[PDB]
Amino acid sequence: GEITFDGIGGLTEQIRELREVIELPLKNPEIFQRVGIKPPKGVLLYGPPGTGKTLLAKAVAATIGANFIFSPASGIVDKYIGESARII
Amino acid sequence: GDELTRSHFNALYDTLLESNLCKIIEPFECVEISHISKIIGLDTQQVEGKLSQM
Amino acid sequence: EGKIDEAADILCELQVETYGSMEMSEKIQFILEQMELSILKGDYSQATVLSRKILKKTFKNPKYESLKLEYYNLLVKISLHKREYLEVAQYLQEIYQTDAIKSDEAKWKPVLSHIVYFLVLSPYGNLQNDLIHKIQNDNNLKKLESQESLVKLFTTNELMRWPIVQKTYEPVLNEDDLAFGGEANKHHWEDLQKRVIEHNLRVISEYYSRITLLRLNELLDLTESQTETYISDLVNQGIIYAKVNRPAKIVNFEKPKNSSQLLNEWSHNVDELLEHIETIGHLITKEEIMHGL
């Protein structure tokens, strides 16, 4: 990302929750397996965008090194046979 | 002491009896009906009639 | 204190919870305590499953002979209670390989004797074929030679052989010293007795084509009733098939026929004949050139 999580501190509770849900399954699957529960697979962000929401999403990608892959929703509709299916 | 079980044990005792008769003969016949009769635990007559049915 | 049940239970939760595979040295010790507790309890199964999982893991990892031997020492005590001789032979066969490289031959040559000896106890062995071939199975020790010759006794057998052989040789043939350590000398005799009798009939079906009943019992040195019982058990197992004349004292070694069975035999002689002609062709070609000279 373009920002870190010290660059946007004062969203704390939301920082702490996102940390534990996305970073942590990569670092140890192992704890979730021994218990036998599946690992977390999804995260949802809602709120108005670019108040802190967009900021969180970038900030998380940075620390993990994770590759951010942005999809524009109106790139996933194009007007030919089977293109919409292929992109997702 | 319950009738339901007692009826199935009756039925099973017959089927087992024929199943034993077939098991004994299974190394093959040219064998004496006196010998089978002793081995199974039974009298001559009962054996002859069950061996025919089989 | 004597709280066998309580110790076994606390162990069961622990080993799974601590470790998937991260540290073996510590995991193996906990597993060892469980195995000990499991024999006494009568709960045969929990140990057997644990021994199998840990063994695979250690083999894949850096190898250590010691660890393995400890799994085995516990296993056989459970195996005696059940009685699968095949099971002990296999488990010992894979540790024989670890012994081969690591350990000196003084341990090794008794282990070899022990695996073939479990396979004597049980009826047949697929496994035995592999072992008999080895060149360290027919030299060296007394115990190795005795063992190779007993598996040979079953092949030639007339069953007057056995008590003279049994009595003369027991260095390892009611005994062990690096596997069970003995089971019970009288109890091993039982397993030996059923196998020799069984094997004398297996070889006789192939060699003979008629035998009288009086003659068969004479070889087994048992009563007609007893020979009759062994014949029954064997036809049932379906390793050999025979027909019985109880009052006329013949044992036939016949089993079903169809003409098509002998058709295959006709067409095998044809087949030996065609193949002969291909050899014949090439042979003529060689022979001529020599004639000329």
Curated annotation (Swiss-Prot), chain A:
Q: Name one GO cellular component term.
A: nucleus
**What biological-process terms (Gene Ontology) are attached?**
ERAD pathway; nucleotide-excision repair; positive regulation of RNA polymerase II transcription preinitiation complex assembly; positive regulation of transcription elongation by RNA polymerase II; proteasome regulatory particle assembly; proteasome-mediated ubiquitin-dependent protein catabolic process
Q: Which GO terms describe its molecular function?
A: ATP binding; ATP hydrolysis activity; proteasome-activating activity; protein domain specific binding; ubiquitin protein ligase binding
Keyword match S-adenosyl-L-methionine? no
Annotated keywords: Acetylation, ATP-binding, Nucleotide-binding, Proteasome
Residues binding ATP: 47-54
Asked if the keyword ATP-binding belongs to this entry, the reply reads: yes
Q: What does UniProt say on post-translational modification here?
A: N-acetylated by NAT1.
Which family, according to the similarity comment?
A: Belongs to the AAA ATPase family.
Q: What does this protein do?
A: The 26S proteasome is involved in the ATP-dependent degradation of ubiquitinated proteins. The regulatory (or ATPase) complex confers ATP dependency and substrate specificity to the 26S complex.
Record's protein name: 26S proteasome subunit RPT4
Note the residue range shown relative to the complete protein: 176 to 263 of 437
UniProtKB/Swiss-Prot annotation, chain B:
Q: Which gene encodes it?
A: RPN6
> What other facts are recorded?
Present with 16800 molecules/cell in log phase SD medium.
Subunit field text:
Component of the lid subcomplex of the 19S proteasome regulatory particle complex (also named PA700 complex). The 26S proteasome consists of a 20S proteasome core and two 19S regulatory subunits.
Top-level taxon of the source organism: Eukaryota
Q: What does this protein do?
A: Component of the lid subcomplex of the 26S proteasome, a multiprotein complex involved in the ATP-dependent degradation of ubiquitinated proteins. In the complex, RPN6 is required for proteasome assembly.
The upper taxonomy is:
Eukaryota, Fungi, Dikarya, Ascomycota, Saccharomycotina
- What protein name is recorded for this chain? 26S proteasome regulatory subunit RPN6
UniProt PTM comment: N-acetylated by NAT1.
What's the family?
Belongs to the proteasome subunit S9 family.
UniProtKB/Swiss-Prot annotation, chain C:
Going by the UniProt record, its keywords in alphabetical order are: Acetylation, Proteasome
Q: Domain of life here?
A: Eukaryota
According to its UniProt entry, the protein's GO biological process terms are: proteasome-mediated ubiquitin-dependent protein catabolic process; protein deneddylation
Q: What does this protein do?
A: Acts as a regulatory subunit of the 26S proteasome which is involved in the ATP-dependent degradation of ubiquitinated proteins.
Q: Which residues of the full protein are shown?
A: 150 to 442 of 445
Has keyword Cell membrane? no
Q: Which family does it belong to?
A: Belongs to the proteasome subunit p55 family.
| GO annotation, cellular component aspect | COP9 signalosome; cytoplasm; proteasome complex; proteasome regulatory particle, lid subcomplex; proteasome storage granule
Residue ranges annotated for the PCI domain, each copy included: 84-258
Q: Under which name does UniProt file this protein?
A: 26S proteasome regulatory subunit RPN5
Give the note.
Present with 5710 molecules/cell in log phase SD medium.
Its post-translational modification remark reads: N-acetylated by NAT1.
